[PDB]
Each structure stands twice: as structure tokens, then as C-alpha cells.
Amino acid sequence: KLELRLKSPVGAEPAVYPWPLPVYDKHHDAAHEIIETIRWVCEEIPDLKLAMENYVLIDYDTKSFESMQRLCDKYNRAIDSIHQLWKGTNTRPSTGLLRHILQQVYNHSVTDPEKLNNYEPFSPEVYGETSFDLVAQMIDEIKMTDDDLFVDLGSGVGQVVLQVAAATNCKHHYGVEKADIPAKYAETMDREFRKWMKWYGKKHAEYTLERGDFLSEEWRERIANTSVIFVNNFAFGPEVDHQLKERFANMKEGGRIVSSKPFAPLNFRINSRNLSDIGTIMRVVELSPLKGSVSWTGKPVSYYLHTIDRTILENYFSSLKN
Amino acid sequence: LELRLKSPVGAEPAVYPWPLPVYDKHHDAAHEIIETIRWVCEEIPDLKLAMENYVLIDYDTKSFESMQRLCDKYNRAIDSIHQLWKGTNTRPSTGLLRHILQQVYNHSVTDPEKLNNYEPFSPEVYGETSFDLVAQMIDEIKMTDDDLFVDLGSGVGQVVLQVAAATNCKHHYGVEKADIPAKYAETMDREFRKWMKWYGKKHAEYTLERGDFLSEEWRERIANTSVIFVNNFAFGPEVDHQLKERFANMKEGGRIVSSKPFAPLNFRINSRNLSDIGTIMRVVELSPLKGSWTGKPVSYYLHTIDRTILENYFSSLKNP
Ligand SMILES: CCC#CCN(c1ccc2nccc(N)c2c1)c1c(Cl)cccc1Cl
Ligand SMILES: CCC#CCN(c1ccc2nccc(N)c2c1)c1c(Cl)cccc1Cl
Ligand SMILES: Nc1ncnc2c1ncn2[C@@H]1O[C@H](CO)[C@@H](O)[C@H]1O
Ligand SMILES: Nc1ncnc2c1ncn2[C@@H]1O[C@H](CO)[C@@H](O)[C@H]1O
């Protein structure tokens, strides 16, 4: 009774919200999530926008049970008419819808954000601010096919994995996280994501979010067999950084690493004193949405693309032999 | 016990005290310093060449010496470029303006709790969607030096500052009645003018004033305004009614951009609704989703004063 229901556009189980509606933060709540969900479904199903009496999307009071109920009811009646129309007569989400889905999955999953103990700009709590856009730019730049295996080393609550799995056709996407609190929230993010993606009728690639230490023996062979590694190594100490380079040194030719800090200098010059360095077996480039034909107006951020290339070491040895 | 950033145009340096201020749970002045440096380097290519690249990768925001080293490397690069230019003002890019407006807010609104604003239109979240929707609005209405822009209920003045940085309107006004945002708007104004000079960026003339937009003085001022911006989403029926009476004195082609329409989108003039504001204005819903938008599914409303709607009704009665 004391609740609001939104029918799924594809006939999945309805989204059920209790009344009073949950509040996510000081300026964000479930009332706005309901309005935006309705708007997104109408935007991408044009018959639905035609069927719905749209005056309610102007005339609404988020603090009134009756007003919010009438808004949900108009949308649900329009869903029923469209289901009748389709009776008589499964794609990847757009970037805009995926941004909404990921936020919605986070709001239903991470109920106590204080527990994360994350005060850095890479916190799950601010993922929608810059990270989502930079991951979308990364997806467009780093071409992935069904022959690729994607791994996020230290995946937090799994946001990058969910975004990449919704956008690409990699064979599989993995997220590995060590810390207890984020790996526990990742279990809910996983269930909430699959549920919401089915509610919208959207496709995603296969993915797994797992609890683990990416420096373990099991993960050594797994990194060696990964074609695309994503790693937020910005705050990693020298030991972890060193151990990671040792793991990357076992990757196949053409294997790629995308990171927030470079693992080798951008201007690496192979000599007799730096033959041990990872720079001898990889090309490194700085990718910035500020560079190119990209219409970027966000933060002046960059990421780094590393590609395993053993010809740098091979050519130096030929120079030494001849 | 401080950090200094030299201006790329030789204005007074930006001075930050140490320990560096914290703005929120994930945002501080150390990130502001780094991003300021990155923006100046991005838009001055010789600067990016002169500066040692490692400096913006290996930094510790919690170390005075590390942050001082970072500022020093940028200041030395500014000095080399100033020497290069010795040896022989534009508008900010959208990206730089977004950074400038956040920076102006960070230095001005020290106690955001005081605003008592829990709505999505709060100054505290302006950079999230409002900034992008205002940028879309500026591209859509295409104001010239003959225009006068007025934001009715301007809060801390963010819309006025954005519009004045982007357009060549003769003047931009913000009028705010509430004490706390009107007081913060005075600081936003000073900080904006200072930061714009620091970057060497141009803006149009603007005034942020404390006042009641329903007063007699404002009645004549609204009548002489060519572009009104108003966030009327939470306005009661009395304010809404009084505003329509103000808009009814505007000139033909006068425009009102708002968060809620002042007249129905499907208004049809008849003998029973001749009193309605819909008889003298066109109304259209503008949505960035219609027409590369991936943000929130938001809309705003454009009203254009057009008394020919009323006139055609009378001429249609006399010419059946
Ligand atoms: C951890 C969640 C995330 C993300 C997106 N991202 C970046 C890179 C630099 C940034 N700088 C500042 C602020 C951000 N939010 C940044 C995000 C990223 C990419 Cl695209 C490739 C490889 C690693 C990373 Cl971490
Ligand atoms: C007050 C600060 C602002 C702004 C930009 N804006 C809107 C309009 C609808 C919105 N919907 C949801 C969320 C937002 N942030 C929205 C912002 C706006 C415009 Cl472009 C024209 C006329 C009035 C308005 Cl209020
Ligand atoms: N050895 C590790 N194995 C898996 N995740 C890790 C490990 N070390 C750090 N992390 C995680 O990496 C993330 C930062 O990239 C954080 O969420 C942090 O908990
Ligand atoms: N009569 C008025 N005069 C000036 N500002 C007002 C008036 N009424 C409301 N406001 C302001 O309009 C804004 C609502 O967008 C608030 O900042 C609020 O204080």
C-alpha cells in the first residue's frame, strides 16, 4: 500500500519503492530517480512518450504521496497501452542510460558510504563526476573484441567492470578487490546491476566480481593470460608497483595496461643501465580527452596506455651484437 | 606557511595558506592547485613544453615540501615563458570556465549549510547538471550586444557569472532577496573578477544585487529586459501570478527561460482564456536529449513575447 511501483518496459518484475521515499544525499533522492527513470524509458521508447499524458512530468510534487502515485500511474498505464500495441503488432544501453543505470545501482547498493573509508577522488561515491566519462572515453579509444579478456585490478565496488561489461563484447570482464567492505558492496552492485539491466531490457557481456589479492600466485597466471588490464595505481606504494611490473612482464605481446599513473617513463630510452626496467618491453602513451577532436569540457585528466612490445629489447640486443 | 601560483598574464599571484583548505569529503585546494596548473598548461602550449613532466605525476597533497616543489616547478616554467615572450584578452573555453566557477564557489561559500537549500538547483551542486544546461541555453538563445540579461532570484550568482563570461550582452543582472545567498554573491563577484584577471580572461559587464524582483523598481526593469532567466520550480501561485503580470509588460521578442512553463505548451486561444499569459507568448520545451548529451534527462522552457497570438484571434473573429 505505502509504496510506488514502476512497470518494466519489457515485462520484468516492477520496480517497487517504499513511501516515504529514500534519500541518497543532501540534494539526491529516490523521487528524482523515479522521474529520471520514467524520462529515460520515454526517451528511448517513442510510442511510450506518445501514449503517456506528459503534463504530470511538469506538474509533480515529490513531497506528496498522491502526486508521485499519479505520476507512476500515468507511466504504468502508458506501459500497458504499449504492451497492448506490441501484442497487436535487447540491445546495449546508450551512454546516457548507462550513466543513469550505474547511479541507480550504486544508490540501491551502497546504503552506508561512510563504511568505504575512501576520501580520494577515485572514491565510488563520486564515480559519476569524472570517472564514468573517462571510462567511456577509454572504451572508445581502446578497441576491445570478443578475443579480449578484461581485468580491473582493485575493482572497489565494481563500477568500472559494470560499465565496461555493458559497453563491450570482451569474452569476460573481471574485477578483483581485496578490502572487505567494497568486496561486500560489490556483491550487491552485481545483483542490482543484473536486475536493473533486465528491468530496462538491456544487454551486457559476462562479468565476475570477486574478492581476492591480485598479488597472489593464482592471480600471477591470470594476469599473464589477460589481454586488457585496468588499474588505478595512483596511490600504490613502491612494493606493489614493483610486484605489478613483475606480473605485467609475463603478459603476451600486444597485451595492454590502462592506468592512472604510468608504469614506465613516457620518454624511456633503453641503455646498459636500465635493461631491468619494464620500459624495455612496453610502449607507453598518455591519453587525454583534452587532446584530439574530443569535445571534452570536464576535468583536465589523463590516463596511460601501456602495450607489451618486446621489439624494444630485441632491437637493442641486435645493436649490441652488431 | 603558504603556497603561491604565478599568474600566466602577470596578475597578483594566487596565495594559498598551509594546511590547505578542505572543501568536502573528496575535494580540497590541493586538487584545485593541480587542476589550475593543468588548465594553464593546456591552454599555453609553450608552458607544457618548458615544465618538467614528472612533477604532475609524483606529488603528495599531504606534504608541504612536495606541494611547494610542484608550485615552484610551475612558477619557474611561467618565468621561462615570460622571458620567451619578452624576447619576442579572450573569453574562457567552456572547460576552463567550469574550473573557474567551481574555484570561485570554493573560495566564497565557506559554510554551505547556511544556504538552507536541499533542492537539485542548489549552488552546492551547480557543476553537476546546471552548468551544462546553462551552456546549452547560451548556445540556443544566441544573445547579442543589444540584449539585457536578468536572472530573477540569482542565488549566489552562478548563472550570471557563467552567462557574463560567455556572451556579449550589454549587461547581465542578478537579483536575489534572501540574505545568506545575497551576502555570498558579494564574495562570488569579487572572487570571479580576481580569478578571471588571474587567468587573463574577458567577461561582459554584470551586477549582482540584493533586492525583491516583485518591487515597483523591478516592474519597469523587467519590462525593459530582453532575456529573463528564472528558476520558478518552487514558486507559489502568488509569485507566479505576479511574475506573469511583470512579463505582460515586456517588449515583442522578449524571452523568458525557466524551469517550469508559465503557460501551457499546447495553449489554444478561445473566448474563455483571453486573460491568460498564453495569449501573448509562445512556449517551447528545450531538451538537450532532442536534436551529444549523455547527462540527466532534463528540460527547460523558452517563452517568447508575441502579441500576434492575441491579434490573430481578434482578426479571425472579424474575418471569418
Ligand atoms: C578508479 C575509477 C576510475 C576511473 C577512470 N580513470 C581515471 C583516470 C584518471 C583520473 N584522474 C582524476 C580523476 C579521476 N576520476 C580519474 C579517473 C582511469 C582510467 Cl580511464 C584508466 C585507468 C585507470 C583509471 Cl583510474
Ligand atoms: C538554478 C541553477 C540552474 C540552472 C539551469 N537550469 C535548469 C533547468 C532544469 C533543471 N532540471 C533538473 C536539474 C537541474 N540542475 C536543472 C537546471 C535552468 C535553465 Cl537552463 C534555464 C532556466 C531556468 C533553469 Cl533552473
Ligand atoms: N593486493 C590487492 N588485491 C586486490 N585489491 C587491492 C589490492 N591492493 C589494493 N587493492 C585495492 O585497489 C584499489 C585501488 O586501486 C582499492 O579499492 C584497494 O582496496
Ligand atoms: N521576490 C523575490 N525577489 C528576489 N529573489 C527571490 C524572490 N523570491 C524568491 N527569490 C529567490 O529565488 C531563488 C529561487 O530560485 C531563491 O534564491 C530565492 O531566494
Side-chain angles (χ1 to χ4, degrees), chain A residues 2-25 27-62 64-89 91-114 116 118-119 121-170 172-197 199-251 253-268 270-271 274-290 292 294 296-318 320 322, chain B residues 1-51 53-64 66-68 70-72 74-87 90-113 115-118 120-179 181-182 184-201 203-267 269-289 291 293-320:
Chain A
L2 212 56
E3 67 187 24
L4 298 176
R5 297 176 163 251
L6 291 183
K7 288 190 173 207
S8 161
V10 298
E13 280 302 299
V16 180
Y17 296 84
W19 182 276
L21 290 167
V23 171
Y24 305 136
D25 73 47
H27 316 97
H28 303 85
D29 58 35
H32 290 100
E33 176 186 307
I34 288 163
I35 290 148
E36 292 168 27
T37 297
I38 292 166
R39 288 182 181 153
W40 269 118
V41 177
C42 294
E43 197 55 38
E44 289 185 348
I45 310 177
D47 286 333
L48 191 67
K49 196 184 278 169
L50 273 179
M52 206 182 148
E53 303 189 76
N54 288 322
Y55 72 84
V56 289
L57 284 165
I58 291 150
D59 184 20
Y60 67 80
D61 181 0
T62 66
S64 162
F65 177 72
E66 290 73 22
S67 169
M68 289 300 296
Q69 192 182 54
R70 172 172 118 253
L71 165 73
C72 293
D73 189 59
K74 293 299 182 185
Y75 160 85
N76 292 333
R77 286 172 183 273
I79 286 290
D80 290 345
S81 306
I82 260 54
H83 289 167
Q84 290 295 334
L85 188 64
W86 294 352
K87 200 169 248 160
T89 64
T91 191
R92 295 313 180 98
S94 67
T95 302
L97 181 64
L98 183 56
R99 184 196 306 274
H100 172 79
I101 295 172
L102 295 183
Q103 181 60 57
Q104 176 168 54
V105 170
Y106 176 88
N107 287 139
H108 290 264
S109 303
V110 185
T111 54
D112 204 336
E114 281 97 323
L116 293 163
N118 205 325
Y119 300 93
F122 302 99
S123 175
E125 317 162 80
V126 299
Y127 188 84
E129 184 176 304
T130 298
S131 301
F132 177 93
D133 292 324
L134 205 60
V135 172
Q137 187 71 26
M138 187 280 291
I139 289 154
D140 294 332
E141 283 175 315
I142 295 103
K143 299 284 173 184
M144 287 181 274
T145 70
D146 60 335
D147 295 307
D148 287 292
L149 281 172
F150 179 93
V151 174
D152 179 359
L153 297 181
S155 51
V157 303
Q159 288 156 314
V160 173
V161 174
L162 301 183
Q163 187 172 351
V164 177
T168 87
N169 74 331
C170 288
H172 211 93
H173 299 77
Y174 295 92
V176 58
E177 175 51 58
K178 197 188 175 183
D180 181 66
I181 306 299
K184 182 74 172 67
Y185 275 133
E187 301 181 36
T188 304
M189 292 283 296
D190 176 19
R191 285 189 298 263
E192 284 291 319
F193 181 78
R194 294 178 197 269
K195 238 166 255 185
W196 278 109
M197 289 287 280
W199 190 95
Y200 289 101
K202 301 297 162 181
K203 189 187 165 180
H204 61 79
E206 289 301 280
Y207 71 88
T208 305
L209 292 174
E210 43 185 279
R211 190 201 178 99
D213 187 336
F214 57 63
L215 295 187
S216 71
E217 288 312 293
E218 182 221 357
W219 272 98
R220 197 185 287 273
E221 195 189 333
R222 301 181 65 183
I223 289 158
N225 290 297
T226 299
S227 66
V228 184
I229 291 270
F230 180 106
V231 57
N232 173 25
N233 64 320
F234 205 89
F236 291 174
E239 192 53 49
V240 173
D241 170 75
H242 175 79
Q243 288 307 310
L244 281 175
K245 291 170 178 163
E246 183 174 297
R247 307 310 190 264
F248 303 153
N250 295 315
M251 291 168 74
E253 203 77 359
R256 291 166 294 172
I257 304 108
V258 294
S259 69
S260 48
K261 267 190 195 174
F263 284 100
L266 292 170
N267 64 337
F268 188 81
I270 187 164
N271 62 55
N274 64 20
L275 281 181
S276 303
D277 299 359
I278 200 77
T280 66
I281 62 152
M282 57 171 49
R283 304 198 310 279
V284 193
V285 291
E286 178 170 5
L287 300 168
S288 181
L290 279 181
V294 199
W296 185 265
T297 66
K299 291 193 181 285
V301 297
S302 280
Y303 72 92
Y304 302 86
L305 167 66
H306 313 71
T307 312
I308 305 291
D309 185 7
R310 282 166 183 110
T311 73
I312 303 157
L313 189 63
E314 283 164 47
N315 300 351
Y316 172 88
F317 266 91
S318 291
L320 233 65
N322 290 69
Chain B
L1 211 60
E2 67 186 23
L3 299 175
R4 297 176 163 251
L5 291 183
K6 287 188 173 206
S7 162
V9 298
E12 279 303 298
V15 181
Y16 296 84
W18 183 276
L20 289 168
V22 171
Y23 307 137
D24 74 46
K25 207 183 169 181
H26 316 97
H27 302 85
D28 52 46
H31 304 126
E32 183 193 297
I33 287 161
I34 291 145
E35 295 166 29
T36 298
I37 293 165
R38 289 182 182 152
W39 270 117
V40 178
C41 294
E42 197 55 38
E43 290 182 351
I44 310 177
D46 287 331
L47 190 72
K48 196 184 278 170
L49 270 179
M51 212 182 143
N53 38 72
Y54 75 87
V55 176
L56 290 152
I57 294 149
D58 323 298
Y59 64 81
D60 181 1
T61 66
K62 303 295 184 286
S63 163
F64 177 73
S66 171
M67 288 301 296
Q68 193 184 53
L70 166 74
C71 293
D72 190 58
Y74 159 86
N75 291 335
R76 287 173 182 274
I78 284 290
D79 290 345
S80 307
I81 260 56
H82 289 169
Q83 290 300 330
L84 188 64
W85 295 352
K86 202 166 168 74
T90 190
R91 295 310 178 105
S93 68
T94 301
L96 181 63
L97 183 57
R98 184 196 308 274
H99 171 79
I100 294 172
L101 294 183
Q102 189 61 58
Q103 176 168 52
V104 170
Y105 176 88
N106 293 333
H107 290 264
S108 310
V109 185
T110 54
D111 205 334
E113 153 189 44
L115 293 163
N116 192 52
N117 205 325
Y118 300 93
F121 304 99
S122 175
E124 317 162 80
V125 298
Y126 188 85
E128 183 176 305
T129 299
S130 296
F131 178 95
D132 291 325
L133 206 60
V134 171
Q136 188 71 27
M137 187 268 302
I138 289 160
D139 292 333
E140 170 70 39
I141 67 170
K142 294 165 204 78
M143 286 181 272
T144 70
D145 60 336
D146 296 306
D147 287 291
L148 281 174
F149 179 88
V150 173
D151 179 358
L152 298 180
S154 50
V156 304
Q158 289 155 312
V159 173
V160 174
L161 302 183
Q162 186 173 350
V163 178
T167 87
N168 73 331
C169 288
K170 190 189 301 164
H171 211 94
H172 299 78
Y173 294 92
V175 57
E176 179 50 60
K177 186 180 77 184
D179 187 60
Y184 278 138
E186 297 183 30
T187 306
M188 292 283 297
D189 176 18
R190 284 189 263 113
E191 281 299 320
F192 180 78
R193 291 184 197 267
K194 175 202 119 206
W195 278 108
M196 291 287 279
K197 282 194 213 85
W198 191 93
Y199 289 101
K201 301 298 163 181
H203 60 81
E205 290 299 281
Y206 71 89
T207 304
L208 292 174
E209 42 185 279
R210 188 200 181 98
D212 187 336
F213 57 64
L214 295 186
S215 72
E216 288 313 293
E217 182 221 357
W218 271 98
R219 197 184 287 273
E220 195 190 340
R221 301 181 65 182
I222 289 159
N224 291 296
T225 298
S226 67
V227 184
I228 291 270
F229 180 107
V230 56
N231 172 25
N232 64 319
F233 204 87
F235 291 174
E238 192 53 28
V239 173
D240 171 75
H241 175 80
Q242 289 306 310
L243 281 175
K244 291 171 179 161
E245 182 174 298
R246 307 310 190 263
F247 303 153
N249 296 314
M250 291 168 75
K251 295 174 187 164
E252 308 303 323
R255 290 165 294 175
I256 305 108
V257 294
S258 71
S259 48
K260 265 190 60 185
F262 284 101
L265 290 172
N266 62 338
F267 189 78
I269 194 166
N270 61 55
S271 67
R272 296 158 308 276
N273 64 21
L274 281 180
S275 303
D276 298 359
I277 200 79
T279 68
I280 61 151
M281 60 173 56
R282 304 279 177 181
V283 195
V284 73
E285 180 170 4
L286 299 169
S287 181
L289 279 181
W293 183 266
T294 66
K296 291 191 181 281
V298 297
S299 281
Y300 71 93
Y301 302 87
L302 168 65
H303 313 71
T304 311
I305 305 298
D306 183 10
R307 292 182 175 89
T308 74
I309 299 157
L310 189 60
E311 195 186 334
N312 301 159
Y313 171 78
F314 283 85
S315 68
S316 173
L317 295 180
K318 304 165 173 177
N319 286 66

